[PDB]
Write a protein that binds this ligand. Structure first.
Ligand SMILES: [Cl-]
Length: 210
């Protein structure tokens, strides 16, 4: 028996409703039926680690569906940092991804898969008529991040200068914020935040209230 109840007890998942926890648990169990977590270079992942990884994968698609993760069959997990291709992660960053700090490698990688589900362009599958307005708000968010970096420096800035430059990277980083530290996102980028709420069919800030 996978320790699903104990798996849920991590900060990034702490604000899910009881129905959301049940729904996430089931999707994660389905994930582990359909996909392999391949721990490399002697890394050993316990059932609790595996359950938590599966849940992190499923969080961004909780309301979209597990089929949104059909662009990969396996996840490769190295102990540490260095198309239909496997998602590559490392255990050091995954452990950080359990916190509600704004960093989440799993969500980052999922965002990239949602983006390219198509070229990696910072635009996931949205209506054709919304693409211009999405790109407008994304690129404004990017310029806003560059202005910050120009003013206070890379270290003091929230986001790395790569997210200010590559729209795909921006999408992926803001997705990390969306799920892990929405207070860094909602008040700063209200228009883009609204589009992400509509795309992901989740409101992580409303969640904290309830
Ligand atoms: Cl949170």
């Amino acid at each position: 028996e996978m320790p699903w109840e104990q798996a849920l007890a991590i900060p990034v998942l702490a604000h899910l409703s009881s129905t959301e926890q049940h729904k996430l648990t089931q999707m994660a169990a389905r994930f582990l039926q359909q996909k392999r977590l391949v721990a490399l270079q002697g890394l050993e992942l316990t059932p609790l680690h595996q359950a938590r990884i599966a849940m992190l994968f499923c969080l961004p698609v909780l309301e979209l569906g597990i089929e949104w993760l059909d662009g990969f069959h396996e996840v490769l997990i190295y102990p540490a940092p260095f198309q239909q291709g496997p998602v590559v992660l490392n255990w050091l960053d995954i452990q950080d991804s359990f916190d509600a700090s704004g960093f989440n490698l799993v969500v980052h990688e999922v965002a990239h898969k949602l983006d390219t589900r198509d070229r990696a362009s910072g635009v996931p599958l949205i209506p054709l008529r919304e693409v211009a307005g999405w790109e407008h708000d994304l690129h404004a968010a990017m310029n806003n991040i560059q202005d910050e970096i120009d003013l206070v420096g890379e270290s003091a800035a929230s986001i790395d200068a790569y997210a200010a430059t590559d729209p795909a990277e921006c999408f992926a980083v803001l997705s990390e914020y969306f799920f892990s530290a929405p207070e860094l996102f909602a008040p700063r980028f209200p228009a883009l935040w609204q589009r992400f709420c509509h795309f992901y069919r989740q409101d992580p800030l409303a969640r904290r209230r309830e």
